Design a protein around this nucleic acid. Sequence first.
RNA 1: CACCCGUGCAAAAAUGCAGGGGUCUAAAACUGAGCGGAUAACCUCUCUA
RNA 2: CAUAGAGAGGUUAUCCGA
Length: 670
Amino acid sequence: SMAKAAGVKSVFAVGNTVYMTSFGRGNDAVLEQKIVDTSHEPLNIDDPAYQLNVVTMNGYSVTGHRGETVSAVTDNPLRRFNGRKPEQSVPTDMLCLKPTLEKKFFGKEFDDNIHIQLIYNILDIEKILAVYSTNAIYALNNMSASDFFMKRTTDETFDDFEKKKESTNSREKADFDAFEKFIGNYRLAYFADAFYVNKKAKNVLREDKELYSVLTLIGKLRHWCVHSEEGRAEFWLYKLDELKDDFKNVLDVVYNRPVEEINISYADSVSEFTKLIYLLTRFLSGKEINDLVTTLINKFDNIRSFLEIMDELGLDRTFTAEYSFFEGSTKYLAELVELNSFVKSCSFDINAKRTMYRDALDILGIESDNNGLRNFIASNVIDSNRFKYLVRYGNPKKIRETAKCKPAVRFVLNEIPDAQIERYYEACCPCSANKRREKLADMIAEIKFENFIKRKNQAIIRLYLTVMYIMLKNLVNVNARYVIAFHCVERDTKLYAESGLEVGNIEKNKTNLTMAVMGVKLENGIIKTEFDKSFAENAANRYLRNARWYKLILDNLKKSERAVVNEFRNTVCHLNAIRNININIKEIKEVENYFALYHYLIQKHLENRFADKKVERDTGDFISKLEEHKTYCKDFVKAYCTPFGYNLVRYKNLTIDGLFDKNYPGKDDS
RNA sequence: CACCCGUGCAAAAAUGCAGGGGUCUAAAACUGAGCGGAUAACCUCUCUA
RNA sequence: CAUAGAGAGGUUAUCCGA
Ligand SMILES: [Mg+2]
Ligand SMILES: [Mg+2]
């Protein structure tokens, strides 16, 4: 947009006045004008970024000075929703939660629209921590190849946990057996950074107490991120100073290892939040660590800039005691950029190079009953980062069976540019681009011991791992969207409840929030109220104020059923859709995009689990089309995507392609 | 090529034109893709000792 | 099966890089 090119950073309504900010150093925002009614007021006299061409209640026109001269217009926030039609009034968020959010974080509602932006940034911090903690937990569950991991409480210490071995309660006995089945697993070496200690050039598995406290911290972070648990648990992440000493010690050693590797400040004074973030990073791919840490840096810097602007205006800003964490956001920003100066992808163990041999041999389906050939293949595979980011997220035999799904590899090869494909093909098999793609796909699907200087083998091996890496990473990044979606459902349910909406229990039925917002109710499990405009005009948020999307969300929700939506929720939140890729991707006639692939996986998982069960006739028709057409059904997607109705933009983005992926826009339907 | 909002001109309650949105979406700017040279460390054969 | 430079290749902190 040209407004940003003109340098108007933000527009802040305060009372009957609006303030306009400029782009300063980094994300610093310097105030420029205080436009009261229709009156000019210079607030900065040194290098003013822009000047006001004309001031009108409709909008303010500005011309850039620092950059290439460009004139733009900025709409008045005071009259955001008051137009043709109370003309001037501070706007509110689309979800109509602004007063509740302000009264949650601050002691009172505020007559401005600055605070809500800080709040939304904090709320985005929690979303990104939710996704990355669920990816960590999934990696660990994959390793086990699961209630134990999902139910980890910080309060419970190791001294209490070990008692469960002696205990007679069957669930507690299983809670301990699942722990003793995790010390080994012949896969714990994957996360050596957080599971092994250096103590002749050798390392050893850490003491059980520290492995437990690592796992406890990560499980608690994940569960707290997803469920937004009530009581004192809600403040947990913003009050880690109260952690048990054992978790402080564990965090201290884990974060201190890089420092002893490099000397940057020791863990003795870096905050527990930063150390917990680093611990979370230990389980992620490098791309995920970078996205996490940069989004944290961005949001904390925004928070700092808003707090500075509020302090310059003289607004009251002191957080309630339970959120006084954010008063330190300057230091947590400094610590996050310090971490970002040295964080690296989590190493494999140099000794486990001999333990991993069967996994490497499995991925390629290369197994029998000279040794040098297999050793060469294995060691050439194991060192590649496309292995480290694959066996941590998929079972090797499951990947090898998935690679037989010819249309999925054919699709992924259709995404690679013609030049890259030519290069690979001329390395791998020394005639048209699509015929070449087809043949390469066939080669990948029939990999065997025929590979046996004439060194062809590196070309074919590096191709295969790259195709499977791209496929699995895309499916994980699709899953992340619905994970964020359910996180938002479970948070906004509680926020609406605190605003006084009769939302009720969300775990009983995940569509309860969208129905509470729409004002419909269930009797005998059926929505007997037909569409009428008054229900849209009375809808509790701006998204559902429109007639046609109320009508559409109603018609889709009426043909949902509770069991399917709950099974979908748990399929997303445990990533079972990809964990059973072998059977879900079994029979796909044609793959159109990663969205169609992911929803085919989910719908085939549902069709497997509901094979012999109660099933509503709408679900039965969807499954019948999912069989008759060997591809995902769009209608079914809408049915199990209903709980996200409250946010129309989210709902639409997650239910038709072309709106799904920012990078692959395309035609929408109807 | 999504949503919401402002403003101007047709019109019968809607459409075309031009913009804005950290307070919409993973989504305020500040991108990404693929790749051509360094030092060292790094294991894997494959050579003989 | 020890331990003895050159050999051949993979991988890792950064531009000259569709
Ligand atoms: Mg929300
Ligand atoms: Mg989850």
